[PDB]
Amino acid sequence: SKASVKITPLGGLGEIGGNMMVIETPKSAIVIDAGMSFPKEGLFGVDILIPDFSYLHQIKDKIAGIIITHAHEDHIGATPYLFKELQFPLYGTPLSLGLIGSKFDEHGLKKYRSYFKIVEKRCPISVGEFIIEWIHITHSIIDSSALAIQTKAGTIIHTGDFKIDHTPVDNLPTDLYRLAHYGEKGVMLLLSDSTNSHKSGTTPSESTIAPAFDTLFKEAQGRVIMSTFSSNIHRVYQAIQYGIKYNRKIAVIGRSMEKNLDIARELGYIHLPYQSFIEANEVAKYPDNEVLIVTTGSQGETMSALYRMATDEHRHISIKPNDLVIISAKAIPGNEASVSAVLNFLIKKEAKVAYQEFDNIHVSGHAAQEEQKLMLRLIKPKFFLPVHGEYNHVARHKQTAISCGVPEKNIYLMEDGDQVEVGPAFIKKVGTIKSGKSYVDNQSNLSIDTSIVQQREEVASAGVFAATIFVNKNKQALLESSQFSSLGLVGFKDEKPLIKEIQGGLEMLLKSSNAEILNNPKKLEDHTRNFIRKALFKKFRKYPAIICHAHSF
Amino acid sequence: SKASVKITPLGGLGEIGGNMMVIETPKSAIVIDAGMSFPKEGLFGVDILIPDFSYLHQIKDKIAGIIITHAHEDHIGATPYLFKELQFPLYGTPLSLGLIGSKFDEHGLKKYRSYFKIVEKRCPISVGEFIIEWIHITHSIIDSSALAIQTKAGTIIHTGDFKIDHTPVDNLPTDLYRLAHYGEKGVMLLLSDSTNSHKSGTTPSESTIAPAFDTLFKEAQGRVIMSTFSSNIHRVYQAIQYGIKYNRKIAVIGRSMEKNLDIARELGYIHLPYQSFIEANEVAKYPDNEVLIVTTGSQGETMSALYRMATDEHRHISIKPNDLVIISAKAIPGNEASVSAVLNFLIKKEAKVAYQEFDNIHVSGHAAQEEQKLMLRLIKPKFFLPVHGEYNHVARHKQTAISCGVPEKNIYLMEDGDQVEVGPAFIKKVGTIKSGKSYVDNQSNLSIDTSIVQQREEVASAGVFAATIFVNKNKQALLESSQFSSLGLVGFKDEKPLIKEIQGGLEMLLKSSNAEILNNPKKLEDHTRNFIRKALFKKFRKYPAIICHAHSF
């Protein structure tokens, strides 16, 4: 009857990152964004997670394209890999589409590059039975945008990643007029950031950071090091601008930085004298006070480089006591241990460290309660649904919305995989769809089901002991010396006896075993598993994986 | 010539917890404290670490006893297990000695219980060539103390764990006069807390917490849950006092809580009507608003209970939407992930949660910069050496000491295992001693070298594939069907072929193998390892552990 849509999301509900939405209307289908989720972060790298793709293959014939709301790795990460399975027009932003093409070429998905479809800011883009608009909106990232969707069913808003910086370094303030206009006409659906719903007071503008660089650089007497990730372009821009202001040549380490710099500079978003850029191998040729280094590893890796620098195998840079190191890695909770370790190792090198001002403690990069309320009033929407956060954060954001006078019955909290049917004046849950994650190794760059590592680590608890006994079916006992191996059981020097005790018990059982059980590998494997379970219960209270091999040679 | 001592520490320098010092003088030796170090904390439990004991066995004939500065698990943890190797008089505090005896009986070390030697507060205790005094000093813990050591070489101060609470619930203010008196006579050596050297402003007094319980309990309409660890006696005391003030029966879950309660109540430190205490199984008989539950697991375990309560197998408590849950686990960095997970699962149960006021964010329990400076002025010591913290924290504390006018040349930063010779007016490093950690399983309660799990997890990276081939020395090939097993390699349904491809290559090599290499297991194992290395390099760029077994049946 009345026009309606079916918006069921694939990522973002249950973890920072890995955001991906799929709006499904009658004979209509659009994709909003495809990020990566980073649960942990260690001394050598990060956890690599890409959203499952099973649902996409179900309704392939309907999806009218991919809609990307960032030139940033956290939100386009699966786009390149996704094309190793399916292809769809990529209607995005010129800068956002570029970096995405770099990702795909790295993923070997040039097919999907032809799908590139530049959407103009403040300019609508007719996507099948839908109209799309990219509303500039301030954020850390050099470029960004939000989506306004017009449909015969109404209008839908996806902001997602936005902090309302009154004075951004790029002084390109959000074009609030359009958002207010959409509110004035009447906005059906709203998707808004919910990350920092636990904090109060508006987040500080990046310009609050400028003084930090200025003061630190005036007092710096030696080399300056900077550590971040491949997609914090604004921060590195500020850093290099100050360095040239302080006559420090820039050394860019990590090919991701180099490609981002070249793409942006060619795109003209910034101005940079190429001669001012240097290699790490040339640092020894320059004075310390003229040396500013930029460091990043693979996609998502920042402090693997730092740790190897503290371990001194970087073979391009030697940490010195007169150095000043500025640390800003992706401040996702649970990485404090790695930061502390590297910090201690650096102080052992007698290096001054600056980390207070760039992590989430000062600048989280996502709206606080006041900013969310300001957006909510700007919109005056009928239906509010939080995305890009955990269940608690969306709960708090919904509470804040209640404080703004939004009727409860138009607010829902999603769980990944869910479907929600939304109409002109109706909204309800209809079912769940299968959502999941997949690992990718930064070296191989292939998708691996989580099942393999899951079982690997599940059996990692408790030991793994395998044995092979060459027994004669006519003797019901081992005829040739059995070979045994163990991993995680006990120290070899101290395990030689213990495992060997269970060994004698087992080979005795053979001396008078059951011929049928001995001749049938299944019975031997079951008996070995039972014996291993009993031994592990006696020793450590576990039941380790036991591999048994029977031969009739 | 001049009197001097040799203080080389065994634990505390490099991690929160696991503090243990050994002062070594001519024909003199004393032990200060033996804690446990907790690097991580998960959904099912904690990491279990006990300091190495190798050095103790070297100078056994000199040590005059064990000196314990807490009735608290974080500082006496290795004492019970240590006695499974060596025995020494335990001169401690009556309450501190009790709990320690409980730990030893759990460890089956009753031998060391006879060594129990009660030291009187404000009363000196002659320990061989040394004089010892237990100076009450405020802290979270119901009881505590610091050590004043008089010697012919001078005086040594160990405070260690102390926050200067002006108004503690127990209103037993630190007896500063003695500390000032020792400063007045002239204090040689000072060992002081250094945990929170990164923070400014004095830590809030536990009394700041009272209002929280009062207000929350006035508004509570349902059951109240409380989650902590076995040794936060003061907090549970406040909680139960308020609950009786609000007519809530107390259910103590975790035998550690029950034993601590019985020991303290028998010791008369507190007053408690036994009839007011209840079991969890009886909660269903009482109204929700009369129900307050206390939860703790094994030593160091707090949220394993919480997680099973969210998973609903606690089979004594069912979480309800009207419940109010107060969470205070040992807030060591890196547990935020578990807290977040449990919090989301609880909100899925629609439960109100209170966690802001009890973690390290409000009350870290260890002195801040102002408190350290106040101690430093109270002492006016000649030699300052920070303990109970990481290298960065001790560095910051030493900086603060510099700000207090302490000459640098009397401040050192230790690394675990080091020896430092300290005289009347001399101090220097002399060498290093072997320091290390050992795991203990909370179920078995035995000491395990870290080597076993270290190799277990080192080989956990990459797969583990073993094979056994029954070959004839006269054929240089397998004569009986070879048996293969793999763990972590690939999914069985998808690994059957791949592993089987490498299998055919290998059994072909047999068809025309080297008889001597085939007959000699070493050559077969080397060839199998090389083949596995090549295959893993081709597939995932790894070199997995390969186990080869050769038979001549």
Author numbering:
A (entry chain A), B (entry chain D): 139 to 691
Give the published text.
The H. pylori RNA degradosome is composed of RNase J, a 77.6 kDa enzyme that possesses both 5′−3′ exoribonuclease and endoribonuclease activities, and RhpA, a DEAD-box RNA helicase, with a molecular weight of 55.8 kDa2,7. RNase J is essential in H. pylori and plays a major role in the degradation of both mRNAs and antisense RNAs8. The central importance of RNase J in post-transcriptional regulation in H. pylori and its participation in an RNase J-based degradosome prompted us to investigate the structure, oligomeric state and post-translational regulation of the H. pylori RNase J. Here, we report the crystal and cryo-EM structures of H. pylori RNase J that assembles in tetramers organized as a dimer-of-dimers. We also show that in vitro and in solution, RNase J is in equilibrium between dimeric and tetrameric states and our data suggest that the tetrameric form constitutes the active form of RNase J in vitro.
